[PDB]
Amino acid sequence: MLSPADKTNVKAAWGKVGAHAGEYGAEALERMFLSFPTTKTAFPHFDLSHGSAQVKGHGKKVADALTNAVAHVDDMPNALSALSDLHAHKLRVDPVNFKLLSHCLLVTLAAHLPAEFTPAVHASLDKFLASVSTVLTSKYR
Amino acid sequence: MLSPADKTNVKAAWGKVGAHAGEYGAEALERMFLSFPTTKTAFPHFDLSHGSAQVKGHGKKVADALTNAVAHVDDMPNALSALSDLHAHKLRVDPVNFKLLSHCLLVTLAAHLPAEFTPAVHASLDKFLASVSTVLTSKYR
Amino acid sequence: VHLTPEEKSAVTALWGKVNVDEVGGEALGRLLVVYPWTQRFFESFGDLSTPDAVMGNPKVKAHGKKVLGAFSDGLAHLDNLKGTFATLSELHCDKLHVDPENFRLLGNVLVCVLAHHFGKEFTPPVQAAYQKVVAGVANALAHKYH
Amino acid sequence: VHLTPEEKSAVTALWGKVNVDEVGGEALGRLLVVYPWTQRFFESFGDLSTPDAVMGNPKVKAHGKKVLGAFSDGLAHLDNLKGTFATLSELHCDKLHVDPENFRLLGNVLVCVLAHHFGKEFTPPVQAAYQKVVAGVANALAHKYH
Ligand code: HEM
Ligand code: HEM
Ligand code: HEM
Numbered sequence: 001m002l003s004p005a006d007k008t009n010v011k012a013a014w015g016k017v018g019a020h021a022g023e024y025g026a027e028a029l030e031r032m033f034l035s036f037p038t039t040k041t042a043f044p045h046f047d048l049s050h051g052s053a054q055v056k057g058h059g060k061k062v063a064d065a066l067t068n069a070v071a072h073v074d075d076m077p078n079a080l081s082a083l084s085d086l087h088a089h090k091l092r093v094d095p096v097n098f099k100l101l102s103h104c105l106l107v108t109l110a111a112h113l114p115a116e117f118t119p120a121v122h123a124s125l126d127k128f129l130a131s132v133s134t135v136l137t138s139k140y141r
Numbered sequence: 142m143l144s145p146a147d148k149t150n151v152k153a154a155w156g157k158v159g160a161h162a163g164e165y166g167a168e169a170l171e172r173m174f175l176s177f178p179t180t181k182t183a184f185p186h187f188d189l190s191h192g193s194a195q196v197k198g199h200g201k202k203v204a205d206a207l208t209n210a211v212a213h214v215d216d217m218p219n220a221l222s223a224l225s226d227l228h229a230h231k232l233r234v235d236p237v238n239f240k241l242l243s244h245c246l247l248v249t250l251a252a253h254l255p256a257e258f259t260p261a262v263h264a265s266l267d268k269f270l271a272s273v274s275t276v277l278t279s280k281y282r
Numbered sequence: 283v284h285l286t287p288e289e290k291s292a293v294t295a296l297w298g299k300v301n302v303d304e305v306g307g308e309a310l311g312r313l314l315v316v317y318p319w320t321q322r323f324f325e326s327f328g329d330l331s332t333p334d335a336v337m338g339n340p341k342v343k344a345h346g347k348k349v350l351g352a353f354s355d356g357l358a359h360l361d362n363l364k365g366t367f368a369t370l371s372e373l374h375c376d377k378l379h380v381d382p383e384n385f386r387l388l389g390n391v392l393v394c395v396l397a398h399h400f401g402k403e404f405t406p407p408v409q410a411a412y413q414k415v416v417a418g419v420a421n422a423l424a425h426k427y428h
Numbered sequence: 429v430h431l432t433p434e435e436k437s438a439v440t441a442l443w444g445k446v447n448v449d450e451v452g453g454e455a456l457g458r459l460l461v462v463y464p465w466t467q468r469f470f471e472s473f474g475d476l477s478t479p480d481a482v483m484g485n486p487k488v489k490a491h492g493k494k495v496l497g498a499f500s501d502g503l504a505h506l507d508n509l510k511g512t513f514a515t516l517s518e519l520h521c522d523k524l525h526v527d528p529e530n531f532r533l534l535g536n537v538l539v540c541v542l543a544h545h546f547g548k549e550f551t552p553p554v555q556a557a558y559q560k561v562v563a564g565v566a567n568a569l570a571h572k573y574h
C-alpha cells in the first residue's frame with residue numbers, strides 16, 4: 001500500500017523523467033537482458049542486439065503503461081486491468097521476472113536522476129513497481 | 142484471489158486435518174528447518190532438536206492461526222491483522238521465508254492426506270497459503 | 283551435489299520403489315494445474331482447461347515419463363549433474379525458451395508427489411535430501427543459459 | 429565467480445574510483461530505509477525512524493564503511509570468495525543470525541548506489557559484471573550457514 005508521501009514522491013520523480021520515458025524503458029530492458037539472461041526466453045521473436053528497434057519500441061510501450069499508472073495512482077488495478085489480463089492469459093511470463101525488470105528500472109532511474117533519487121524516493125519507487133508488478137500478476141491463477 | 146471452489150476445497154481439506162493440526166504444524170516446521178537451514182536464523186532462541194517442546198508449541202500456534210484463517214477465509218485481512226502487525230513491526234521475518242514454510246506445509250499435508258490431496262485441492266491450498274503469506278507481509282513497509 | 287552418504291543412500295533406496303510412469307505423469311500434470319501459466323509451452327497437447335482434462339491427457343502423461351526418465355538417469359550421476367544435463371540445458375534454452383524458474387517449480391511439485399505417494403516413509407530427513415537433488419538438477423538444467 | 433577478463437577489468441577500473449567510506453554508508457543507509465525490516469539487527473544504533481535519521485546516523489556510517497571495507501577486500505580475491513569470506517560467513521550465521529537474503533538485498537542496493545554516483549559510466553555491460561560480483565559475494569557469505 002502506497003502512502004500519501006509515496007504518491008508525492010512517485011509523481012515528482014516520474015515528473016522529471018518526462019519525455020525520456022521511452023528511452024529509459026528501452027535501457028531498462030537492455031540492462032535486464034544483459035544482467036539476467038534468462039529473461040530473454042520471454043522474447044525469442046525479438047532481435048535483441050544493441051540499438052534494436054523492437055527493443056526501443058517495446059520500451060516506449062512499457063514506459064507509457066507506467067506513465068498511465070502514475071496518472072491513475074489511486075486506481076491502479078482498474079487502470080491496468082487490461083494489461084493484467086494480457087500477461088496472465090496470453091503472455092504467461094513467469095512472475096519472477098517482474099522483480100528483475102523492476103530492479104533494472106530503478107538502476108536506470110538512478111543513473112539518470114542524481115538529484116531526485118534520494119533514499120526516501122528510492123523507497124517510494126521501489127514500493128510503486130512492486131505494486132505495479134503485483135497488479136499485473138494478480139490474475140495468473 | 143480465491144474463487145469459491147478454492148474456498149470450498151480449502152475448507153474440505155482442513156476439516157479432515159481436524160485434531161492433527163498442531164502435529165502437522167510442528168511437522169512442517171521440522172521439515173523446513175532441515176530442508177531450508179537458513180530459516181533457523183529466525184529462531185536462535187529455540188531448541189531446534191527433534192521433538193523439542195518449543196517447536197511443538199509453536200506448531201500449534203501456527204496451525205491455529207491457519208484454522209482461524211480458513212474460518213475467516215472471506216475476511217482474511219481483518220482476521221489476521223494482529224499477526225500481520227506482529228510480523229511486520231516486531232519479528233520482521235524476511236518475506237522470502239513464507240514461501241518456504243508454505244511449501245513444507247503442503248508436503249506435510251500431501252503426506253498425511255493422500256486421498257484428499259487431489260490436483261485441484263493442491264492448487265487451492267497453494268493459493269490459500271500464498272494469500273495468507275501476502276496478508277502477513279502486507280504491512281512490512 | 284554436496285550429498286552425504288546417508289543422504290545419497292536415502293535418495294537411492296526410495297527411488298527404487300518409484301513407478302516412473304505414474305510419478306512423472308502426476309508431476310507434470312500437477313505443474314500445469316497448480317501453476318497454469320506453465321501451459322504455454324504445451325499448447326499443442328490439447329485440452330488443458332480443467333484439472334481432469336490435464337490429468338487425463340495422454341500427451342501430458344507421456345511427456346511426464348520422458349521428463350522423469352531423464353531425471354532418473356541423472357541420479358546415477360550426482361557427482362556430475364552439469365555434464366550429464368549439458369545438452370538438455372542448451373536445448374531448453376536455445377530451442378525451447380523455457381525459463382529455468384519452471385525447473386524449480388517442477389522440482390517442488392515433484393517433492394509433493396513423492397510425499398503423497400510414500401506417506402510416512404517420506405520423512406523430514408528423506409525430504410531434505412530430495413530438496414538438494416531437485417535444486418541441483420534445476421541448477422544444472424539452467425547452467426548453459428546465455 | 430565466472431567473470432571474463434574484460435568483465436574483471438571493468439569491475440576493477442570503476443572500483444578504482446569509489447570512495448568506500450561514503451559509498452559504504454550510502455548503501456547500508458538505503459538498505460535500512462528501503463527494506464525497513466532489515467533494521468531488526470541494529471536496534472543498538474539509536475534513532476532510525478526517518479530517512480535522515482538513518483542516513484545521518486554515525487553508527488550506520490561507521491558500520492557501512494566496515495561492511496564495504498571487507499567487500500572491497502573481496503574484490504582483490506574474485507577467484508576465492510568462498511575462502512576469503514569463510515570466517516565472516518560463520519559469524520553471520522552463528523553469532524549474528526542474519527538471514528542471507530539480506531546479502532542479496534544489499535547487493536542490489538549497492539548497484540543502485542553505484543549507478544546513482546556514476547551515471548552513464550555505469551553502462552549496461554558494467555552493471556552486468558557488477559551483478560555477477562554481488563551475487564558471488566552473497567553466495568560466499570552464505571556458504572557456511574548450517
Ligand atoms: C513493469 C512491468 C511491465 C509492464 C508495465 C509491461 C507492460 C507491457 C505492455 C504495455 C505491453 C504491450 C502489449 C501491447 O501490445 O499492448 C507488454 C507486452 C509484453 N511484455 Fe509486459 N510489461 C511489464 C513487464 C514484463 C516483463 C517482466 C515481462 C517478461 C520478462 C514482459 C514481457 C512482455 C512480453 C513478452 C510482451 C509482448 C511483447 C511483444 O510480443 O510485442 N513484460 N508489456
Ligand atoms: C504460514 C505463515 C505463518 C503464520 C500463519 C504464522 C503464525 C504465527 C503465530 C500464530 C505466531 C505466534 C504469535 C503469538 O505468540 O501471539 C508466530 C510467531 C512467530 N513466527 Fe510467524 N507464522 C507464519 C510464518 C512464519 C515465517 C515463515 C516465519 C519465519 C521463518 C515465522 C517466524 C516466526 C517467529 C520467529 C515467531 C516468534 C516465535 C516465538 O518467539 O515464540 N513465522 N507466527
Ligand atoms: C527435471 C526437469 C526437466 C527435465 C529433466 C526435462 C527433460 C526433457 C527431455 C528429455 C525432453 C525431450 C527432448 C527431446 O526430445 O530431445 C524435454 C522436452 C521438453 N521439456 Fe523438459 N525437462 C524438465 C522440465 C521441464 C519443464 C518444467 C518444462 C516446462 C514447463 C519443460 C518443457 C519441455 C518442453 C516444452 C519440451 C519439448 C516437448 C516437445 O517436444 O513437444 N521441461 N524435457
Ligand code: HEM
Nearest residue numbers: 466469470494495498499516520524526530531534565569
Ligand atoms: C557485503 C556483505 C557484508 C559484509 C562483507 C559484511 C561484513 C561485516 C563485518 C566485517 C562485520 C564486523 C565483524 C565483527 O564485528 O566481528 C560485520 C558485522 C555485522 N554485520 Fe555484516 N556484512 C555484510 C552484510 C550485512 C548485512 C546485509 C547485514 C544485516 C542486514 C549485516 C549485519 C551485520 C551485523 C548486525 C554486524 C554486527 C554489528 C555490531 O557490531 O553491532 N551484515 N559485517
